[PDB]
């Protein structure tokens, strides 16, 4: 009835067109066979068509289509569709990343003359972790440091964040729960006989992997140590925890799948001919990436390798998995997109505007892959075509020591951890903002 309302209050002119004379419902039914790019053009033919093409339930569907699940709201006349403004807002954001003028980013100076070893981004809070022994909580909206988490004696190397709870890991073989609001250590977790290297936080439990070859499952609330997973020869490099199984990757070339409650090792995955360094897990598939340049896809329920994906030429550092699409970053300067169902390498992200050194990090979504590198750049790529789009960041020092360690992206901003082993680049975060005004 938002359209009936519109008709009698605007009272458009008489029209001699098929859809103006069709019963209003059958017109919408015809208008529905169109793609949003068409609806947007159709809305500019006449006032009657503009009114018809603002049917809320026609756009609630185009959003559900494109994975837009919430309407947008704002604060003669027009009755705008919130689903339609929601849809446009997103197409504008996408265009902003893709070809929007790059507004100079907020510079977040900190961790002077040290590395940013781990990075978290939740809502409006950024958490940088460093070998300076400290962690720092920032606002993505203001660029101001709000808390410096001092308490660790060795250097921070792992991190996890839910909501105002921060976990940290260090060379001091302790973990630490923190109040992101009050920068207050609430728990110090003891038990690891080596550096606390990786951690993964499911809900009220974090699993930690250590240089001592063990993992420990901890209770974020109480601070207890629920179990200790023992079976790894070499140090434990990467960990994943879905709440039902722990999957771990060790310098001993092995992937281990645990049932934590029983402290039992359910599977030892054998195949990697070198140290496994990176891991993804979706409750069904384990994906491991090795210093042996291969990536393996295993069935968690049988321990069976399903695919061994080859083609990378060096250490697969970071991986991201999402609905059976996998994206891998490697020291070979290349990023690959894979279909872990079929094993096919969908795309190799290289070309004339490829990375010049190793890929340090990546994020992706249904449209884009964001890659960072020691060449001092952050690149944006078309996930669907594999094509280079543009450099979002280009450190002037990229060729002489400038480096991008790590990136986190939201729908509207990109956070970059930047620095250098040699003074060319003051260490800092860059925060890019791709939001649109509406």
């Amino acid at each position: 009835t938002q359209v009936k309302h519109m008709m009698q209050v605007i009272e458009p002119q008489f029209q001699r067109d098929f859809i103006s004379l069709l019963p209003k419902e059958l017109a919408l039914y015809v208008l529905s066979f169109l793609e949003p790019k068409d609806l947007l053009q159709a809305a500019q033919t006449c006032r009657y068509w503009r009114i018809l093409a603002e049917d809320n339930l026609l756009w609630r569907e185009k959003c559900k289509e494109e994975g837009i699940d919430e309407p947008l709201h704002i604060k003669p006349g027009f009755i705008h569709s919130p689903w339609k403004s929601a849809y446009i807002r997103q197409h504008r954001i996408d265009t902003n990343w893709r070809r929007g003028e790059l507004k100079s980013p907020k510079v977040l100076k900190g961790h002077d003359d040290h590395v940013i070893t781990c990075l978290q981004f939740c809502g409006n809070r950024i958490v940088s972790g460093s070998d300076d022994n400290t962690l720092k909580v920032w606002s993505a909206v203001t660029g101001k440091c709000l808390r410096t988490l001092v308490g660790h004696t060795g250097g921070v190397w792992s991190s996890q964040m839910r909501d105002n709870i921060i976990i940290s890991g260090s060379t001091d073989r302790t973990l630490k729960v923190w109040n992101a609001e009050t920068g207050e250590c609430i728990h110090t977790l003891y038990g690891h006989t080596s550096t606390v290297r990786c951690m993964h936080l499911h809900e009220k439990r974090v699993v930690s992997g250590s240089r001592d070859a063990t993992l420990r499952v901890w209770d974020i609330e109480t601070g207890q140590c629920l179990h200790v997973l023992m079976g790894h020869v070499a140090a434990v490099r990467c960990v994943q925890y879905d709440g039902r199984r722990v999957v771990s990757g060790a310098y001993d070339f092995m992937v281990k799948v645990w049932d934590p409650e029983t402290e039992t090792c359910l599977h030892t995955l054998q195949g990697h001919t070198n140290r496994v360094y990176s891991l993804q897990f979706d409750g069904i598939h384990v994906v491991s990436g090795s210093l042996d340049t291969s990536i393996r896809v295993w069935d968690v329920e049988t321990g069976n390798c399903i695919h061994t994906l080859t083609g990378h030429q060096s250490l697969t550092s970071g991986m991201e998995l999402k609905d059976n699409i996998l994206v891998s970053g490697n020291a070979d300067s290349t990023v690959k997109i894979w279909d872990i169902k079929t094993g096919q390498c969908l795309q190799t992200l290289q070309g004339p505007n490829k990375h010049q050194s190793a890929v340090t990090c990546l994020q992706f979504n249904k449209n884009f892959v964001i890659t960072s590198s020691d060449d001092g750049t952050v690149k944006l790529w078309d996930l669907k075509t594999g094509e280079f789009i543009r450099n979002l960041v280009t450190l002037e020092s990229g060729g002489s020591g400038g480096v991008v360690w790590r990136i986190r992206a939201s729908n509207t901003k990109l956070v970059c951890a930047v620095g250098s082993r040699n003074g060319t680049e003051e260490t800092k975060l860059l925060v890019l903002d791709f939001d649109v005004d509406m």
Partner: peptide
């Protein structure tokens, strides 16, 4: 190569 904790 890349960053890693110092060996103890």
């Amino acid at each position: 190569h890349e960053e890693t904790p110092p060996t103890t």
